[PDB]
Structure formats: structure tokens, C-alpha cells
Design a protein around this ligand. Structure first.
Ligand SMILES: Nc1ccc(S(=O)(=O)N2CCN(CC(=O)N[C@@H](Cc3cc(F)cc(F)c3)c3nc4ccccc4c(=O)n3-c3ccc(S(=O)(=O)N4CCOCC4)cc3)C(=O)C2)cc1
Ligand SMILES: Nc1ccc(S(=O)(=O)N2CCN(CC(=O)N[C@@H](Cc3cc(F)cc(F)c3)c3nc4ccccc4c(=O)n3-c3ccc(S(=O)(=O)N4CCOCC4)cc3)C(=O)C2)cc1
Ligand SMILES: Nc1ccc(S(=O)(=O)N2CCN(CC(=O)N[C@@H](Cc3cc(F)cc(F)c3)c3nc4ccccc4c(=O)n3-c3ccc(S(=O)(=O)N4CCOCC4)cc3)C(=O)C2)cc1
Ligand SMILES: Nc1ccc(S(=O)(=O)N2CCN(CC(=O)N[C@@H](Cc3cc(F)cc(F)c3)c3nc4ccccc4c(=O)n3-c3ccc(S(=O)(=O)N4CCOCC4)cc3)C(=O)C2)cc1
Ligand SMILES: Nc1ccc(S(=O)(=O)N2CCN(CC(=O)N[C@@H](Cc3cc(F)cc(F)c3)c3nc4ccccc4c(=O)n3-c3ccc(S(=O)(=O)N4CCOCC4)cc3)C(=O)C2)cc1
Ligand SMILES: Nc1ccc(S(=O)(=O)N2CCN(CC(=O)N[C@@H](Cc3cc(F)cc(F)c3)c3nc4ccccc4c(=O)n3-c3ccc(S(=O)(=O)N4CCOCC4)cc3)C(=O)C2)cc1
Lengths: 202, 199, 199, 204, 202, 200
């Protein structure tokens, strides 16, 4: 990271590997990635991505997304030989740390004002991670129906777990409740809160 | 958190501690003070980071947004809001929750002399919501905590006050043997005294 | 704790206190661990630590009663118009316990020259309460620690002093064989000597 | 590593490297972990880390051969001759970069010189060359043998495909070819230029 | 410990000492671990560490007796009206043990130029007591460490010297070897090293 | 270790790491470089601290003293041996921290130029640790023969594991018939990578 270039710590390295081992591409992996990559350089981001073993389908999908974003960046911000000793503008492949050196990355990130290549690359990675999370999501919200014996709260957990991978209350949530709870919910007037709905089916 | 005045990253130890607490204790009451301690110094972004890392409990987490919203809207009522160039704008409710504010703005408010402590304000909101969740996930009313016929007084009292924390009766709801003894201590007895007398 | 400014309680500290209470309940050595883990602590930090304890809510309520007696007694010995502007007010008992005081006030008192050490005072109260709890949860009277007919002397002595810590007799309560030997050492024998003689 | 003076390798670092090797052997992701754990490393630190590995001594000896080829090639490109100028900084031979004939002070000297001779980063590059050769060796399967099972979900196939490939455009050639008949037909119907995301959706 | 001001004992330190005692009781190597974990310690820190030990209360009471003998002997060798105002008093034995001294007084002595190292003195006392405990909890006399008829020489030697360390080679080691190895060892005759003895019975 | 230039305490992480390594790996060869890394910056006292925390292996630990002594005595031979307030020269027993104080150790180590008593003592300890590692080594390289069903790579692991505790002369010789024939056909100058590919 940049704090000066600090090395990624062992605690950070291990935390990212473990999260991926234990949670695959469950949605909460994304904010953990983002938090664990606080201050990160493109190199640090590549380091973190490279340490993931397995999920190589997902990881290759992630490269495709990163590429689309690199190419689009080159469209919006185009770039002879550079002025000697001066700071060049970064191409998309520089933001991803493919054609840039660590010193160049630090240069951009600490420049006054900053070209925050870390934060830009992170944004791209997260775009790709979100696409993966939807893909690895096993179920459509349309198929989250409350079991005949399922407590309302557990249903709601599934409902919103599923929804996070891809107003909700007033449409599909009541619709997809089981008959007993659906009747009770319908009897509550418009504009009922989730707290209220859950109390009423407890 | 905040560490010329600049954002320190949330540490891995902090991140993991919060996830684990939620995994192991769900919405048992002591999760709240742990959240508060683990979020010492936190910016709104750090608070959002911590909340977002929770997997599961998405009913609870959506309930939490509703509460946060009520508090945001009420804040906009009490403290209403083009801004002077290069000066510090006043934060709306959605800025305190880190929805419409940047990290730099959050640091700005928090380190301003005097401080607008948007971290502490947002934390207060989150805790309001966390308390509502804790009551919800509380399985039992204090009215239903009755001492078992063979239950030692101390275990009863643990349950009594466990239940009460999630939300006279104590003697009332004791079992006949211990109720008689307690009544004989008469007014003003301490809990230590009650517990000794039924040991 | 304090560094003049508040350092956050660390995750390692938070977890250590929770684990100690989970694993050892109110065994006597929990007290010195609490005291060590709360080194430097503000009243807020002490409340944070106490609040993170799940379970034992009977004990925790007992602890409040004790804290209250000590708060009231403090108000007796050190009584307190509106304060001089911008000057440091004297702390009431409820301020020492962090109930009616702010963090800044706590830091104020603790770092003042000379210090009003509200952290150390509150800690002293908590430990008073923790000691009462430890005696309560102590299962056995020292009067009932008798050496088994087949029990090695050392194990007896461990139990003897374990029990005694939670709250002459030692020789008295030894088993016949070892009692005879001990009596033969006659007055002024050391514990090392007693234990060698019954090994 | 370096702080101008040598900081010790930390216990956390030492243990992390040993554990990675214990748990993952020479699976590909060991390499970037080695590289990250050896951030800031001196040649001595790199030797320390390599020496703490128990087992895999075939691999570790193979690694020396590779390091040697790179040392010798370095001596070809950057030669040295007489006795050195008193009190001055000598140029490093290949065996100096590997920390075999160099002192810690010399390593720090080169690494912190203005401008730096980054002997740590050079030696690391060599080690990684050798680690890659080992990873291919310990790779059990050729990409040519990664065929989708008749009941294997496309995604699992793709995981294996690219796991295998990492140890040694791929989509358009062998990936479709080696898919199972049902999914191969579907993929062929998408025709040129399909993305991996698209292929995977179509066989889900 | 000390940084002039008191640093708190760390949780890592606290836990390490408790665990050592839980896992190894009063095996000899607990002593040097205690000493290392108590580097820089004040008398208060030493009391803190001793107080966190649960169980072994016989041993812990024995330890007080030893500490007392050393306190009283210290008062004999270094005897002590009311003190000069604002000046540094001389420490009595009970001050070194942190019984009648404040933390500030302990820091005072320890950081004075020149130092009265009350931490190191108290540590020395504690270790004296810990050694007496280690001998006590030692189950076996070196006289009873005999090599089993099937026991490899090396294992015997481990036990021999384990036992010997708790009490604190040309004689008893050969003597107590089993017949087969005893004959071989005797044939090496005077002046054999342990390395040589062990090779010869491997 | 060392940071008035002053002694930093050995950390709990360091202390525990050394104890655990010895518990889990005994005197397998890789314990040595771990000892050396964990004892980075160490004073003689720190080295004694680390050695003293080892429970068990007291045969080995006594053997280690013998080796340390030989090296102490030899040091006294090569460098024989005071002015008020000045720095005395260290005897062998001073390097091992037996007759020296912590302050003296720090003195030597931070003197300009340094008398690196930590590094010297470490060198001695490692000499002794190496003798122990050979001793606890169960097998001679002469007895590492490839099993009839053993994959070449596993054989090579054993070969070099064994060899480290104490190449392609004995390595090919001791291979199993099938692989030995193939290896011999590669003829002089084959690399280990090549040998291993050819028997995979
Ligand atoms: N044609 C073909 C297809 C597959 C294979 S393969 O399956 O055998 N194999 C290739 C090698 N790696 C490692 C790798 O390239 N890792 C990235 C980081 C990364 C890891 C991920 F798991 C997922 C990500 F999205 C990004 C990397 N590591 C760096 C390390 C040290 C310095 C530099 C780099 C750097 O640059 N990158 C890297 C970063 C971004 C891209 S890009 O594809 O997204 N891109 C291209 C240039 O324009 C900008 C964006 C490519 C590589 C593999 O993952 C798997 C081989 C050939
Ligand atoms: N109707 C409907 C129903 C479900 C879904 S969903 O299930 O698909 N989905 C939405 C997206 N996220 C992430 C998210 O929004 N997280 C919050 C923090 C948070 C996490 C919690 F688990 C619980 C909380 F209460 C708060 C957030 N993450 C940030 C991250 C990076 C920068 C900024 C933010 C920021 O601002 N917030 C955020 C904070 C507060 C609110 S608010 O709803 O309470 N609010 C609205 C504006 O006024 C201020 C207060 C909203 C978002 C999800 O978790 C779930 C979508 C629509
Ligand atoms: N009559 C009755 C019976 C039960 C319940 S209840 O079961 O619903 N419930 C209420 C809430 N809490 C939390 C709580 O109050 N925690 C304390 C710290 C503490 C925790 C313990 F587990 C044990 C202790 F002894 C002390 C606290 N937390 C703070 C946090 C943030 C800022 C401030 C505070 C602060 O001030 N205190 C606090 C500290 C001391 C006291 S006191 O009662 O001892 N006291 C009163 C004023 O005079 C000084 C001393 C009260 C609260 C509960 O545990 C129990 C409610 C009413
Ligand atoms: N012919 C033959 C066959 C087997 C054996 S053996 O099996 O009995 N045995 C020998 C001793 N070591 C330790 C060792 O050499 N370790 C290396 C680091 C290292 C570890 C690895 F596991 C793998 C690597 F590739 C590199 C080392 N440790 C240092 C430590 C303290 C200071 C200095 C050193 C230093 O210099 N090196 C070292 C580093 C590189 C090489 S080299 O062979 O690659 N090379 C030689 C000169 O030109 C530069 C490069 C040699 C030694 C063993 O592990 C194995 C001995 C001879
Ligand atoms: N007659 C009789 C006999 C036993 C019992 S009892 O079984 O109920 N017993 C259990 C143990 N503790 C704790 C305790 O005293 N801990 C010591 C340190 C210590 C712990 C050990 F486990 C072992 C040690 F050897 C030393 C202590 N804790 C401090 C903490 C906060 C500030 C101060 C202190 C301080 O001063 N000391 C302390 C240290 C040394 C001694 S001394 O006895 O060795 N001594 C007396 C004065 O002259 C100097 C030396 C006494 C207390 C008790 O209170 C009482 C009750 C009545
Ligand atoms: N004849 C006979 C035979 C056995 C026994 S015994 O089995 O009962 N024995 C076991 C071990 N210890 C502790 C001990 O001596 N530990 C060493 C460090 C060490 C530990 C090891 F496991 C292995 C090593 F090689 C070195 C030590 N601890 C220090 C601590 C605090 C300050 C100082 C010291 C210091 O000096 N040394 C120490 C270091 C080196 C040597 S020496 O033997 O190698 N030597 C002698 C003088 O010339 C220089 C070198 C001796 C002691 C005992 O006292 C009791 C007693 C008498």
C-alpha cells in the first residue's frame, strides 16, 4: 500500500486468501476485498488477485471485465516521446499495473493532485467481482418462496440474500410469502415497514 | 478510522473481529458494545464497510436501513441546508450515513475545529437500529421468565436479566419455595441478599 | 485507554477479556486479568469491557449494586453552584463510573496536573464488586476442605488455597497419616517443609 | 528486509511462508505469495526463506540449477577485474546476487545505493523463474487432457481448464473443442467472438 | 514494563504466561520463559503475572514463603526517620516485592541514575522460589533413572538430563545404562564424550 | 535483541515460534535456519534464553554445550587476554553469555567497530545444531534406494532430504531398474530437471 510504499502485510495476505476459501463469491466478499485493499497500488491489487487459487473461470472472467474498462478508459482519456523527467499520463494498461512500474504507480497516486490509479483499478475489479457474484448466485429472487413451515424471518433473510446477489417488500416479498402470513400482511395497510411485517408474522 | 489529517485503514484484526462476532453471537445484546468498541474512531465509510462485511442476517440489515433513514430524515428536519467556494458545507443526513459524502468530506467534518462528528452521529443511528433488531430477535418476554421448580435461583436470575437486557417481577416469578423466603426478607433487599437467601 | 487523547481499546484486548470470562467465569484469577487488560482504561473503556460480557447478568447486576454503594459513599466524602466557565469541575460518583461524564471530561481528570484518576478509582470499585461475586460463585467453605484418604498432600494444599483465595486448619484437616507426621515437625514449620514431609 | 539498515524477517512472515508451502506445495498461487511475503527482501532473506522449507528437496535442488543458469548468464552480460578501488562499491557477480559470496552489508549497499543495484529484486526474479519450472513439473495434467465430463457443469470444467493452463484465445480453440457434446453444440451456435461470461451463461 | 513511564503488559504477554503454566505446569523450561516474558517488568507487572495463574496455589504459597525469606534477608543487608522531602527513599524488601511500594516509586528506582533495579531484584527472588517449586514437582531422583531393557540410549539420556535439570555422566549415566550398552560404554573407557557414548549405543 | 544503544526484549511471538518449531520438527534440518532467522539481532543472553526455553531433547542440549565449549576454548587459543571505564576483550565464556553481562554484550555488539558476540555465539550454536541434526538423522544416503513402485520424484525428495542431514553418482545408481536404464540412456551431464522429466 501507500501510507511511502509499505509491503502488503502477512495478515492482509492471509485474510484475503481465507475469505475467498471460506466464502467463494458470496456478496460480502466484495466489501472485504475493498477494505483489505485499502491504500492499495495496482501491483498490490494484482498481488491479491494472483494469490487466489482456484476459481480460475471467475478470475478469467474478471480479466475480460477489466479489459473492457481499460479500453473504455483509453477512449475517454487518450495519450510522441514524453517530456524528459516529467510524469506521463496513464493508459488503461498502466492503471491495471500491466505496463506500469511500481514507481510510476506511486508517482500518480501521490502526485499533487493525485491520479488515483489504485482506486480506479479497484473500481474496475469490483465491477468484475459483481458480475461474478451474480453468476455464482444460484437462485432468482422470483424463486424465493416462503416454505409452509419456514419462519418469516428466515424467508426474509433468503429473500434479501438472493436480492443482494443480483419497494421489494410491497411487491414480491408479500406475494411470495406463504398463505397464512400473506393474508396477515395483506391486512396491514399500504406503506407497512419491514419491522412491522416481521412482527406481524413472528 | 482517522489518523495533515488523514484516514487510517481499518485493520484486518478489526475487520475479522466484527465478522466473527456476528457469526458467533448473531444479535445477542453484547454484539452492540462490541460493534461500538470495534468502530472506535470510525468514519461513516468505515461504518458502512463494517456493516457491508456482514453476510447473512439480511432481514436485520434491511431493517437497519429503515431505522437509519428515519434518523437521517429527522436530522434534515432539525438541521436544514450554492455553497461558498472552498469552504466546508453543512452535512445532510445522507452525508452522515456516507451515502452522498466523500471520505475527504467525512474527514473534513470530523477533524474540523470545532468537529462535526459525523462518525459518532452515524454510529448513534446504527446502534438505535441494532437495538431494535436485538429486541426483535429476543425470543421471550420478561413476563414469561419463571423460575423452574428445580432451577437454582442464580440461573433464573441470569435468564431474568438476560431477557430484560434484550428489551417486583423477580420475586413474583420465583418458585414457591424461594418466593416464600424472599418475601420474608421484606422491603429493600439487595440482589446479593436475595441470592444468598436462595443459594 | 489514554495517550492528550483517547486511544481505542484494541481488538486483542477486547477479545481477551471476553474469552477470559467465557473460559473462567468468576474464578479468582479473572480479577487480576481484568485489571491488567484494563491498564490505562478510562471509565468508558471499563464500561465497554463490562458491556461486552454476555451472560452472567445476575453477577453483572450485583456488580452495579456494589458500584452504586461506592458512588454514593464517594459523594458523601467529596461533595460538590454552576461551575467557573472553562474550568475543570469536580467529579461526582456517577461521573467516575462514566454514567454522567463525557470521554473528554474523563481524559481531562485523568491527565490533569495533578491527576484525578477516575479510571483507577472506577477500577477499584469494579474490583470490589468482582470480589463479592467471586466469593458468591465460590462453591466450598475452607471448613470443608479435608484431605482425602488417598489424596496426595500437594493436591489437598492446592484445593485448600484455591478455596481460601475465593473467600491451623491445614494441619487439622490433613488425613491421619500426614497429620501425625506434620504434628511431629512441631511449631513454625514452613509449607515447603510440610509438603516434603508428606510427599 | 531493509529499513540504512537490515530489519529482521518477522515471525509472522517466516511462518506464513512455511505454512503456504506445507498446505499448497507447488500449486501456482504459491509463487505470488512468495513474492509478496518477500517484499523488501535481501538475498540473505530470500535464502533464509528458501532454507526454512522442509521437504520438497528435489524441487529445491532443481531451483538451484535454475538459479545457477541465471547467475552464469548474468556474469556473461555484466563482467568484472583487478583489486577494487579502496572504500568503493564493487560490482556484484551472479553469486553475489544470490547471497552466496556477498555479505549482508554489501547487499544493503547495492540495494540502497543511489542509484540502486536491486540485488534483492534480481535474485527474486531468478527464484521465481525456478519456481515456475517446478510448478509446471508438479502440474499433474496437460491442458490437452482437460475434457468436460458428461455430467460435469460447464463452470467446473472451466475452473479445471484454467487451473491446468495457469500451471503451464484459449476459449476459441481448445475450450470449446473439449466441451461435452451438449454444451459444444450450444457454444458453436454462439459463433465467433463469444466472451467467457457468455459461454458460461449459455451452458449453466 | 517501563518506557519515564509505565507501558502496560500486553495481552500477548499475559496470555503467553497463563498458557505456559497451563500446558507445562512447573517443568524446568517454564522458568526461562517466565524470565523472558517478564523482560522490563516492574514489581507490579511481576505480581500481575503471578496473580493471573489459576491453580497451583500450593506452589504459589510456597513461592511467597521464598519471597519473604529474601525480603527479610534484604532488610538485614540494606537497612533503612522520615525521609528528606521530595527525595528518593531507599526500598525495603516489601517495596521490591511491590507490596508497600507504588508504581511511581518502582519506576523511580528503576529509571534513577544510577538504577535501583527493583524489577530485576524481585525477579531474582521469584526465580529462586520457582526453582524450589520445580525440584518439588520433580517426580524422580536421578538415582532412579535406569535405561529400560528395550529403551534406545538417546531416550534414556533425555530422561536422565530432564531429571537432572529439575534437581539442578562418567558416574551415574554409564552405571545406570542397560547391560548391553553398559558393556559397550565401559569399553570406551575414560574421557568419552556424550556424542561418542550416544553413537556407540545407537 | 538490540535497538544509549539498548536491549529490546525478545517478543512473545518470537519465543513461541522457537518453542513450537522444536516441538513440531525436533532436529529436522530446517530447524537450523529457522533458529537463525528467529534469532536475528540476538544477544548471547537472547540466544541462551531461546535455548533454555526448549523442553525435552536434553541429550541434544547437553551435546550442544560440549560443542559450544570446544569453540569457546579454541577462541581463547586464537584471541588471548583492564583500563578503567574502557572496553575489555571478550573471552569465549563471554561470547556464550556465561561470564558477561547484558551491558557488556551490548557494548561489544554496538561498538564502532563491532565485536559481534551475538553472531559469533550463533555460529557456535549452529555448529552444535548441525552435529545434532546428523545424529538424529535415521538413514545413510547409501541406503536411499528407489522403491519398485516409488515415483522418481518421491525418491529424489528422500535422497536429498537424507543428504541435507549429513550427487547424480549415487542418485542414478540407486534408482530402480526401469528408471535407471532410462537415466543411463541420457548419458553424461543430464540435469535433475531432465532426469525427473524422463522418469515422470
Ligand atoms: N491468454 C492467456 C489466458 C490465460 C492464461 S493463464 O490462465 O495461464 N494465467 C495467466 C497468468 N495469470 C496471472 C495474471 O496475469 N494475473 C494478473 C492479475 C490478475 C489475477 C487474476 F486472477 C485476475 C485478474 F483479473 C488479474 C497480473 N499479475 C501481474 C503480476 C505482476 C506484474 C504485473 C501483473 C499484471 O499486469 N497482471 C494483470 C493485470 C491485468 C490484466 S488485464 O488482462 O485485465 N489487462 C490487460 C492490459 O490492459 C489492462 C488490463 C492482465 C494481467 C493468471 O491469472 C492465469 C494465459 C494466457
Ligand atoms: N430496495 C432495495 C432493497 C435491497 C437492496 S440490496 O439488498 O440489493 N442491497 C443494496 C446495496 N447494499 C450495499 C449497501 O447499500 N450498504 C450500505 C451500508 C449498510 C450496510 C448494511 F448491511 C446495513 C446498512 F444499514 C447499511 C452502504 N454501503 C456503501 C458502500 C460504499 C459507499 C457508500 C455506501 C453507503 O452509503 N451505504 C448506505 C448507508 C446507508 C444507507 S440508508 O438506506 O440507511 N440511507 C439512505 C440515504 O439517506 C441516508 C441513509 C444506504 C446505503 C446492500 O447491502 C444490499 C437494494 C434495494
Ligand atoms: N433496573 C434495571 C435493571 C436491568 C436493566 S437492563 O438489564 O436492561 N440493562 C441496562 C443496560 N445495561 C448496560 C449498562 O448499563 N452498562 C453499564 C456498564 C456496566 C455493565 C455491566 F455489565 C456491569 C456494570 F456494573 C456496569 C454502562 N454502560 C455504558 C455505556 C455507554 C455509556 C455509558 C455507560 C454507563 O454509564 N454504564 C453504567 C455504569 C455504571 C452504572 S451504575 O448503575 O453502577 N451507576 C449509576 C450512577 O451512579 C454511578 C454508578 C450504570 C451504567 C445493562 O447491563 C443491563 C435496566 C434497569
Ligand atoms: N552438490 C550438493 C548437493 C546437495 C547439497 S545439500 O542438499 O546437502 N544442501 C546444501 C546446503 N543447503 C543450504 C543452501 O545451500 N541453501 C541456499 C539457499 C537456497 C535454499 C534452497 F532450498 C534452494 C535454493 F535454490 C537456495 C543458501 N543458503 C545460504 C545460507 C546462508 C548464507 C548463504 C547461503 C547461500 O548462499 N545459499 C545459496 C544460494 C544459492 C545457491 S546456488 O547453488 O543457486 N548458487 C551458487 C553460486 O552462484 C550463485 C547461485 C547456493 C547456495 C541446502 O539446502 C542443501 C549440497 C551440495
Ligand atoms: N494468611 C493467608 C494466606 C493466603 C491467603 S490467599 O490464598 O487468600 N491469597 C491468595 C493470593 N493473593 C494475591 C496476592 O497476594 N498476590 C501477590 C503477588 C503474588 C502472587 C502469587 F500467586 C504468588 C506470589 F508469590 C506473589 C500480590 N499481589 C498484588 C497485587 C496488587 C498490588 C500489590 C500486590 C502485592 O504486593 N502482592 C504480593 C507480593 C508478594 C507478597 S510476599 O507475601 O512474598 N511479601 C510480603 C511483604 O514482604 C515482601 C514479600 C505479598 C503480596 C491474595 O491476596 C491472598 C490469605 C491469607
Ligand atoms: N555438570 C552439569 C551437567 C548438567 C547440568 S543440568 O542439566 O542440571 N543443567 C541444564 C541447563 N542449565 C541451564 C544452562 O546452563 N543453560 C545455558 C544455555 C544453554 C541451554 C541449552 F539447552 C544448551 C546450551 F548449549 C546452552 C545458559 N543459561 C544462562 C542463563 C542465564 C545467564 C547465563 C546463562 C549461560 O551462560 N548459559 C550457558 C551457556 C553456555 C554454556 S557452555 O557450557 O557452552 N560454556 C561454558 C563456559 O564457556 C563458554 C561456554 C553454559 C551455560 C543448568 O544450569 C542446569 C548441571 C551440571
Amino acid at each position: 500500500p501507500i501510507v511511502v510504499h509499505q509491503c502488503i502485510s502477512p495478515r492482509t495476505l492471509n485474510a484475503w486468501v481465507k475469505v475467498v476459501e471460506e466464502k467463494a463469491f458470496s456478496p460480502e466478499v466484495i466489501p472485504m476485498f475493498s477494505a483489505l485493499s485499502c491504500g492499495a497500488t495496482p501491483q498490490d491489487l494484482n498481488t491479491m488477485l494472483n494469490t487466489v487459487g482456484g476459481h480460475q473461470a471467475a478470475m478469467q472472467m474478471l480479466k475480460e471485465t477489466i479489459n473492457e474498462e481499460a479500453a473504455e478508459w483509453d477512449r475517454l482519456h487518450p495519450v510522441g516521446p514524453i517530456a524528459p523527467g516529467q510524469m506521463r499520463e496513464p493508459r488503461g494498461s498502466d492503471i491495471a499495473g500491466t505496463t506500469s512500474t511500481l514507481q510510476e504507480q506511486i508517482g500518480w497516486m501521490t502526485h499533487n493532485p493525485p491520479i488515483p490509479v489504485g482506486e480506479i483499478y479497484k473500481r474496475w475489479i469490483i465491477l468484475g467481482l459483481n458480475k461474478i457474484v451474480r453468476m455464482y448466485s444460484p437462485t432468482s429472487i422470483l424463486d424465493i418462496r416462503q416454505g409452509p413451515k419456514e419462519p418469516f424471518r428466515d424467508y426474509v433473510d433468503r429473500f434479501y440474500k438472493t436480492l443482494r446477489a443480483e419497494a421489494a417488500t410491497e411487491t414480491l416479498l408479500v406475494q411470495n410469502a406463504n398463505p397464512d402470513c400473506k393474508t396477515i400482511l395483506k391486512a396491514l395497510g399500504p406503506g407497512a415497514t419491514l419491522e412491522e411485517m416481521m412482527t406481524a408474522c413472528q
